[PDB]
């Protein structure tokens, strides 16, 4: 058992169904940042991919996470989407 | 619980040169406390690199804490 | 748990033999008085009846020979802060208040004639001219009222400092035109029938320098003065500065025998010559002891102390001459220059009639 009162862990970008349906193939990179807000995570190792992660651990022991990975070609145009709506654990 | 309330009037001792007597005080005080009792007291104070130092002589009218030496510093 | 401090160290009561034996002929208590509240509540006279009031609101009319009252009315709800000089003319007594009321009373029986709101507290005494009552309020507004109704005929607005001495500056009239003081050092004048503006003049640099004091006008010369300001003389027709003195003033002044009699901010008394700021004499004695308005009575200038005494000064000589009884809790408002008579009201509500 563990019962100690943790505050709600929350991390990353906020996600909602009406915000993710904005993204579609071929948008320019500034349009994505305008629709969803700025990416709080990106690949620093020299490939232009943004990791919109939405994560919460509400209350006692519940856990939830959505991940939305966006891949851009050079000059900042979106090529592919990888949306996982729930933690694949 | 312990409770103490005290009031005091100052009349410094010039035993030492004014220069060193600037860092010195002498005071006369009355207090009431429940532990109910009332008391009157004489106090000498000095300051040093060790912190502040007090020597005090007192009489509780309910008669004892009649003679005290005290030091108290924050770090 | 307490402490106190002082600066001015007022004069140690200079004193002299009471040569002319001036003393109370009669005295009456109307009630409470102004007490500590500086406010120009003072008694007045008409047709051998003297009228007086208590700042709580209660007002009385007294016979000047013996001091027995004939009235009592409350002017109040079931205090009024009745405040400002009592003024009397013919059928009516007029009184101001610190509660924006002006009251009119019937001189025949003391019944309340009419009551009308004015724009703010009426610290000025009312003044009656040309069939109108003029009142100057603390909001810097002259208001002219119909004497049978108090209905406003016209109103005029003056500039208000962010900090002032009390704005009494009661108006005066000549040739059918009014002249008035005001805060921020302004003298001004207006046409009595309609409130049209006439010339205005800035008494001094301004830091307080309110012209809080009623400007007397004689032969067409207006005299005006201010706190840390300058005494000035003014052409009623143009407001040209005839002359000035760096002597300031604090409460009141009088012209009689075309000679000027003053009280300085330092509670010293002096007489100035017909024109130009030069003193015949100065009585530097009473320094920093609040002096009432000086009244010329039967050839002697009488001034009341903050405490109980009345000091008697010669009309033209530089002599301090007599010192009457220590009257109850002293004075804080101007005696009345009654013809052949004296009446003064002490702080506590005791009124005194004085003879020699």
């Amino acid at each position: 058992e563990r019962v100690v009162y943790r505050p709600d862990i929350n991390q990353g970008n906020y996600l909602t169904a009406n915000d993710v349906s904005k993204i579609r193939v071929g948008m320019t990179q500034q349009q994505v940042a305008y629709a969803l807000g700025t990416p709080l995570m990106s690949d620093p190792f020299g490939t232009n991919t943004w990791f919109y992660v939405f994560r919460q651990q509400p209350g006692h022991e519940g856990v939830t996470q959505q991940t939305l990975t966006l891949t851009f070609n050079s000059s900042g145009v979106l090529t592919n989407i990888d949306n996982k709506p729930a933690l694949s654990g | 619980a312990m409770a103490v309330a005290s009031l005091e009037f100052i009349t410094p001792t010039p035993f030492i040169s004014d220069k060193y007597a600037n860092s010195v005080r002498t005071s006369f005080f009355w207090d009431m406390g429940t532990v109910i009792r009332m008391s009157a007291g004489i106090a000498l104070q000095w300051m040093s690199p060790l912190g502040p130092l007090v020597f005090s002589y007192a009489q509780p009218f309910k008669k004892a804490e009649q003679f005290q030496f005290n030091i108290g510093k924050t770090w | 748990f307490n402490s106190e401090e002082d600066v001015v160290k007022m004069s140690p009561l200079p004193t002299v033999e009471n040569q002319f034996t001036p003393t109370t002929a009669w005295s009456t208590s109307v009630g409470s008085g102004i007490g500590n509240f500086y406010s120009n509540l003072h008694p007045a006279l008409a047709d051998n009846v003297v009228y007086a009031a208590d700042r709580a609101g209660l007002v009385k009319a007294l016979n000047a020979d013996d001091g027995k009252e004939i009235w009592s009315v409350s002017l109040a709800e079931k205090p009024a802060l009745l405040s400002g000089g009592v003024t009397v003319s013919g059928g009516h007594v007029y009184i101001g208040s610190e509660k924006a009321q002006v009251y009119a009373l019937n001189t025949s029986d003391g019944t309340v004639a009419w009551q009308t709101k004015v724009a703010g507290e009426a610290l000025s005494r009312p003044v009656v001219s040309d069939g109108l009552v003029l009142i100057h309020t603390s909001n810097g507004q002259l208001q002219a009222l119909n004497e049978a109704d108090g209905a406003v005929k016209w109103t005029v607005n003056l500039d208000m400092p962010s900090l002032s001495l009390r704005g009494e500056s009661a108006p005066t009239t000549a040739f059918g035109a009014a002249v008035v003081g005001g805060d921020n050092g302004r003298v001004s004048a207006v046409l009595m029938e309609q409130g049209q503006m006439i010339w205005q003049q800035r008494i001094s640099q301004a830091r307080l320098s309110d012209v809080d004091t009623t400007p007397v006008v004689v032969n067409g010369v207006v005299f005006a003065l201010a706190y840390n300001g300058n005494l000035t003389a003014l052409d009623l027709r143009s407001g040209q500065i005839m002359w000035k003195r760096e002597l300031g003033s604090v409460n009141d002044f009088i012209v009689d025998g075309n000679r000027i009699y003053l009280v300085d901010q330092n509670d010293r008394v002096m007489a100035l010559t017909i024109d130009g700021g030069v003193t015949l004499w100065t009585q530097s004695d009473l320094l920093h002891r609040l002096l009432t308005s000086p009244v010329l009575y039967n050839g002697n200038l009488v001034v009341g102390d903050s405490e109980g005494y009345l000091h008697w000064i010669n009309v033209e000589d530089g002599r301090f001459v007599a010192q009457q009884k220590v009257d109850s809790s002293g004075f804080q408002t101007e005696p009345v220059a009654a013809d052949g008579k004296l009446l003064i009201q002490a702080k506590d509500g005791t009124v005194y009639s004085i003879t020699r």
Binding site: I9, P44, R55, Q65 | - | -
Partner: protein, 217 residues
């Protein structure tokens, strides 16, 4: 502090300074500065006064005196010495209090005095690379960058325990771009790998794994 009819206050005060009687030095230098503010004993005096404040550990006053000097004479021919003392005064504020006596590695305490110090020494050696001080200043800079990186790791360590996995990755990435070559960055790469793994971001986890596995000794 004393009456000084003669400028001799500067010679005997130098002797007190050579003796390390810092008390005497600052008080006589302050007296000389106040009494002779515009003579030759002014620039000649401000430097010794700065040095005495530093050795007296009177660092807030040392900051003010150094700041005054650079403002009043930005081109003095030994201004590089004043920059070196700027960095050393700021670096002396970092090692505050009784820590180290108990062995407390205080490298987690507020780094701003360290980060300032790094700016000062780097400004020096970029400006005056021929100066004698550049060897020490570069030794001071390598320690100051490692001390900053240990701070950043310390926060990455805390958020690893709190499980704020975005707060981990976003800071250890910050170390890789601001502090790449320090040992503390090499110690942080496991926390980045862990954080990506807990977030199911395995691709990034493998990438950081490839980095660390190539760079481990």
């Amino acid at each position: 502090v004393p009456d000084n009819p003669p400028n001799e206050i500067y010679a005997t005060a130098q002797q007190k300074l050579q003796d390390g009687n810092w008390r005497q030095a600052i008080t006589q230098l302050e007296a000389l500065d106040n009494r002779y503010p515009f003579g030759p004993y002014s620039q000649q005096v401000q430097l010794d006064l700065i040095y005495a404040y530093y050795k007296n550990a009177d660092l807030p006053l040392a900051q003010a005196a150094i700041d005054r000097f650079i403002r009043l004479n930005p081109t003095h021919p030994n201004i590089d010495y004043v920059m070196y003392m700027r960095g050393l005064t700021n670096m002396a504020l970092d090692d505050s209090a009784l820590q180290g006596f108990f062995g407390v590695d205080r490298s987690d305490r507020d780094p701003q005095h360290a980060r300032a110090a790094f700016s000062d020494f780097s400004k020096l050696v970029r400006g005056y690379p021929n100066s004698q001080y550049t060897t020490d200043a570069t030794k001071r800079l390598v320690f100051l960058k490692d001390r900053l990186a240990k701070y950043e790791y310390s926060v990455a360590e805390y958020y690893t325990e709190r499980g704020a996995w975005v707060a981990v990755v976003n800071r250890v990435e910050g170390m890789l771009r601001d502090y790449p070559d320090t040992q503390a960055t090499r110690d942080a790469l496991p926390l980045m790998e862990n954080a990506y793994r807990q977030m199911q971001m395995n691709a990034q986890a493998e990438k950081v794994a490839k980095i660390i596995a190539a760079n481990s000794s």
